């Protein structure tokens, strides 16, 4: 619903002849998806990595603490892939990452 | 390219043409090592460790029995060239371990 409202505001901005960047602000969200998070860790953009303790197959995350240690990324193993899914509006998330937050946080 | 002699036999035989130099075909880049593939293979080697036959060959190379190590690696892998390449790979691993220690 929030995305629909944002797209409606951007459509009105285009209709009145303004850029969508003039009406929308840069977003700050929790990064998720295993391939996306691994790419962020390899590019050293992630500030914090949280890895679910119950990933089956375990090979999807068995290299990830060593990857974080090599890239100097703070990581933590946390209970609940469903618990991370509640963050990312999914049933299950194998891993989540924080890259940057707002100035008040 | 060396110009052909224009004869039917001998060294550098064949009809004379003006040979061209070719930009290398991208299909021939296979085997070239990439930075990401280096990083991923090094990380997987660090995570997983060695095979038992690799440990046996490393023990033989530490003990200095190079001929026995090559023979054992040939018996394990099947071919002389693969056995040889595995021998320099494990020697490099031993050298890295010694320079770390």
């Amino acid at each position: 619903q929030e995305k629909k409202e944002r797209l409606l505001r951007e459509a009105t901005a285009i209709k009145e002849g303004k850029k969508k960047e003039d009406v929308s602000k840069k977003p700050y969200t929790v990064k998720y998806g295993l391939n996306h998070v691994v790419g962020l860790i390899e590019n050293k953009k992630a500030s914090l990595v949280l890895i679910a303790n119950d990933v089956d197959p375990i090979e999807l995350v068995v290299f990830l603490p060593a990857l974080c240690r090599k890239m100097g990324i703070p990581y933590a193993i946390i209970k609940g892939k469903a618990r991370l899914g509640t963050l990312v509006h999914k049933k299950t998330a194998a891993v989540v990452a924080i890259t940057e937050v707002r100035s008040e946080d | 390219p060396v110009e052909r002699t224009g004869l039917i036999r001998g060294l550098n035989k064949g009809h004379k043409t003006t040979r061209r130099v070719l930009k290398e075909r991208p299909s021939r880049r296979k085997g070239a090592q990439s930075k990401r593939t280096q990083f991923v293979r090094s990380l997987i080697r660090e995570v997983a460790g060695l095979a038992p036959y690799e440990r046996r060959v490393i023990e033989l190379l530490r003990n200095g029995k190079d001929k026995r190590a090559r023979k054992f690696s040939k018996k394990k892998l099947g071919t002389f060239g693969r056995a040889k390449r595995k021998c320099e790979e494990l020697q490099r691993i031993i050298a890295e371990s010694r320079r770390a220690h």
Binding site: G39, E42, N43, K44, M71 | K35, R36, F39
Partner: peptide, 8 residues
């Protein structure tokens, strides 16, 4: 850092 490709 390790990159898969150059990015825009």
């Amino acid at each position: 850092a390790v990159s898969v490709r150059k990015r825009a």
